[model samples]
Target: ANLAPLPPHVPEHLVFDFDMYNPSNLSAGVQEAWAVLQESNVPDLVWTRCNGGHWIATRGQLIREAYEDYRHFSSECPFIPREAGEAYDFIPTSMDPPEQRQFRALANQVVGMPVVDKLENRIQELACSLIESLRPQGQCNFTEDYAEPFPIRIFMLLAGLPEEDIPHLKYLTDQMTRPDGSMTFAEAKEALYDYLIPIIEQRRQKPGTDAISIVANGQVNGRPITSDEAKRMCGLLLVGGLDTVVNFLSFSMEFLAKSPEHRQELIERPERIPAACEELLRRFSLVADGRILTSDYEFHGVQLKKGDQILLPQMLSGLDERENAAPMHVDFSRQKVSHTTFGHGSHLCPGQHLARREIIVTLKEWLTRIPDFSIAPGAQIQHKSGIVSGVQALPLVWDPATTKAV
Candidate 1:
């Protein structure tokens, strides 16, 4: 039950309504949003009612401020509004820190630590194996074929989830992000929660050495996390660990394909991938709506009130002309690429370190062989929403003639 907005700040030129649940609204969703925020003539601040009327912070500094000042803004329900965010449940992600931090520790403990060299050898081998199998085929659906499976399988191996469950779990997560409206957010969320219940319960009763089972039985805030809580926490880890990297791989590959010059730079300085990841993140800003104010407070002379949600859109700030000069262009030489793409301050993404390793490894390895590729002729590049915003598919056609290792 979302109420009409009463913005604390006023005299702003545009209003941004973020109520995504409305069929008419989300249909004209994010790209319409890019219109307001990333278009040639953009505004300093826009008042909108997307999920419901809430102010948006379009500048880099203001976004950092809004996310950092939890008092004025809150993470309690850090999402669109009643219809989308209210019922969607995942532990730690939905919990504020200290309390949140405990489960997060378990999360990091499980995924953040490096796989044994032999395990990594296997991961690298697997990526190559996967790439090799697809190499002869010059064209394929990158998302469905390569992107989703690779990291998802890696995550399943790391978490020790059953192989058969991958497709089922993936479908549930996709619903939470790109819900078809066949199921309500609560239904989808509950289904995911229900799926993990038995796993957590079994692990709690008799924990196994595997990361998922261990995390299932772990204590948090001086008490064991409930089976339900453990399930939700694991679900967050699984979804977060898999989805973003999957989309990112597709994005990076598609971008590198078009810009052979930048691709060559990476090929020349393969060691530059770590820095390259930061630049890519800044440009794409692959994350969903985060941060909503809990109470009335002034930030940079703008007053925000209780119950008002402010969209710190992941894609908003770095694209702001005022924040980054020539913001639309991607420059590998960018010195201080700044924005809260992974988020800022305490809520900074914990799995970021691992995600970086995978991405860096991916760019380094993939470019070594398939150094040149481009969007396939006559294929549409589709962009869509998720927890991270990204292209739905990047159909590419590199001259198969460029196939090295021939």
Candidate 2:
């Protein structure tokens, strides 16, 4: 394939020309497509012309450095294309430090450990119910049946939104990440904002215990939050709730459906499910958010110009050879499993506690009931890649009688 012609200053060899949104390197698998970053062939920092041309940090070392040096790598414009980044004003996410902290604290109050602990029972119950219902069928579209419903239902409950709103909200959120060429980032974001506006207004007038109500009536830095501010923050929460865990569960289950050895390993020592969950997080880490360079600087021998869009892929960091040994291998008992699957620095995912709890519960509950499940016979599981890549569909099958209701 011909490399996209680079800017005059960019050296030709440094141009990897990969599309972060839709990489041509996805032949083997989505994870493998990202693994191309760690291949010995590519440089630590490379340029790609996809999405209006951006620089990509190919190693965990550079990725972390870029994340830590917020003054240089500004999160104000964090998306791939400059336009999308400009339109991406999701609460604390789109703001830099000193200013990002106040709202971040507010966001934390909604999703932090306190909230997760409060919802623990419901989370556990929902996972059990979803799995038990699927168990009797012996065949299920795991992505739709289990992955989509389990965490999403809990999030909807938290937000105090009706289950019926999922399709509309999920569609809007999906456009922000994996645009189908129908809507621009700003357009998608505006649509999402439109949906949230009325909800925030309603919550503001009549406060309740729901997540949205907390944000709508909540204060930031001792000042009452404005309707617009509350809406923006709630928009971010909506994306996180609807998007992150749903896709992640699919990735984890897809791997389990194929690897009986790993499944059996967890089944025999169910207590190790958390450890195994961490290992899977490393291997299948799937998120790619970038920063706009604030000034011209030579990083890792590559010249990055100010305003340049450089992607510090959280998905690529842990998989980097320099970060972890046997980066691609899933070893539950590995002494130290490290990765930025959630993210790094001050911008680390506030909802990670909830995400982890969801993953572990699904694993423990599902395995306890259907101990012998596999990929549907001759089914080819497909994966979709984007800012947040994931398994397109996970077809899982098992003998109905083999499943025990727990």
Candidate 3:
């Protein structure tokens, strides 16, 4: 890890050499790796020299506070390493409240609860189809065979994009969130824009029932949306749709594969699946984006200078012991599952409803068909971390006779 020079304002004790892209204990698990920050000795807020150097909020309280106080910590640069945030100009996510609200309203029109409700049938059908196809196989690479395709294909259907474009779109989206050194965030953003620019233009010329068309022809604050704004918003939608749920399903399934009792709980009581979904969302919560310090400010006693980026990991909130009792344990009956998984404050994710629908559907459908499954022998599930943490692959196996097609 190449450590950056310590800024004069930051104290030596406040510095923690944590790298979000590759936490040292990643071999244990992504969440476990991040839990290192919440250790007793680690400060609630520490400056990490990794990824061009930035501050990291280790506790849930600080994360919630920073997210709520957008003025001190603006969303103008939500990505870390400074460079990615500088290049991250994705509609309302990059803008603070008031200005952010209008664009958010437009975004909700495309991905909000109502949209998910409308797509409910398709979502259920897709999940069932995918699970059924994999049922008789007895073994499968869960990530590629089901996790990637299930949510992504539904998103393509909703966006009115072709399935053929998934590889290209997913590759670019992955590069932006989890850079493999193949392309910079800016280049990935531009490539996504290049792809959407023409599509947004076409949708503008003739609107349809699809999401792209809805956003393309969307009116913000009673004024017609510009082509540039449409592309930016659509680009954000693409990244969220393609990446978020795809990786989340992998984590949730990987857990179920290893913990049969947890899977049994759901299989015995299907009504608990919804509650389990929320609990699973809490325990396996992912997605971590930060804010740029709007000005030199004192936060929880530490002095933060203007332009300093603080990584307020949404993933760590539910994992923090103070926020939830026995944070690591996945109890389906937990009374309160606290988390900012979808995010917190004004910039909370608009697509959360759709994401939950996809997740719940996958769990219900998969477990109903293939109730007894485990991690394939001799296969080690690896995880990769970035703005979003994900399983590199999940190899699952079960007896063919154990699975049923319904």
Candidate 4:
């Protein structure tokens, strides 16, 4: 991996030198690779020699501060490698407050609490239907068979996109976060725009109850949203819909399959599903987005130069010792559970309500049906590391008679 020489101010000792997209230290797992940041000896903030060199906030304390202080750390260039960040033009997420606020409310309207409430019946029904179909099978690739299809299908329904478009849309979204070495960030983004251009146009002409129609025809800050703005904002929604919760579900289910005590606890007391979801989310939190330094300034004893990028990983925060006891352990009954798994400050994930509902519903429905499942015998589960780390595949097995059809 070709890396640039260390910058002038960064001390050699302070440079941890690891890649965010593809870490050289991924033998244990992606989560474990990131957990090295919180180790007692590591600095709270350090410069890395990976991805053309950048600063990394290792602890939750500095991560929250960088995210909250938007004036100093701007969202103008939120991704790494500079080029991908340059190509990233998603609304609200890629835009800072005052300006970002203009479109944030519009984004909330599309996937906020109200939308989750409206879609509850469909969300619940879909979880049961998907699980019931797989119950008797007794063996399944949890990632492909259950995790990917469940929330993604509901998101497609909400977006008014065809179920068949998933392969194309998912591929494009994957390229942005985890590129396949075939496409640049710009080309991948353009491909996504090409796909959405026609659909958003049709939604404007024949508006419906779906999310795309609302975004296409809706007004932002008392002014009608333009076609280009609509496309940019809608593109953000597509990424959130297809990507966020899909990997998380796989992580939680993988853990449950191996931890019988945890699964049985949830199985006996089904009401613990929501609290369990929160714990699992905190334990398995897997998103890391960065912010660009607006001007030359000092942050937490380190001098940050103008145009510098800082990665504030959402995964490392909850796992910080200051935030929780034994951070790596997943304890459902941990009183006063606190962390920034969704995010912090103005840019907190607006789609979190929908995400929580989908996760909780899956936990309740899947466990009720297939309570005795475990990781496939003699199989080693593999995790892929990137902006969002996730399992490559989750192969689970159980006896057919053990699964009770609902």
Q: Give me the candidate number with maximum lDDT.
A: 3
Highest-TM-score candidate: 3
lDDT by residue (90-136, candidate 1, tens digit) is 77767665567787778767766454332577568767777766777
Q: What would you estimate as the lDDT of candidate 3?
A: 0.93
- Give the lDDT of residue 305 in candidate 2: 87
Better of 3 and 4 by TM-score: 3
Clash number by candidate, in order = 17, 0, 0, 0
Give candidate 1 misplaced runs (Cα > 4 Å). 1-14, 17-35, 38-44, 115-119
- Point out the higher-scoring one by lDDT: 2 or 3: 3
Please state the error at residue 290 of candidate 2 in Å.
0.6
- Please provide TM-scores, in order, for all candidate models, with all chains considered together: 0.89, 0.97, 0.99, 0.98
Per-residue lDDT of model 4, residues 310-394, tens digit only: 9999888988989998988989898777778899979999999999999999998898899999999998988877777788899
Candidate 2: where are CA atoms >4 Å away? 1-5
Superposition error at 159 for model 2 (Å)? 1.0
Clashes of 1: 17
Candidate-wise lDDT, in order: 0.69, 0.88, 0.93, 0.88
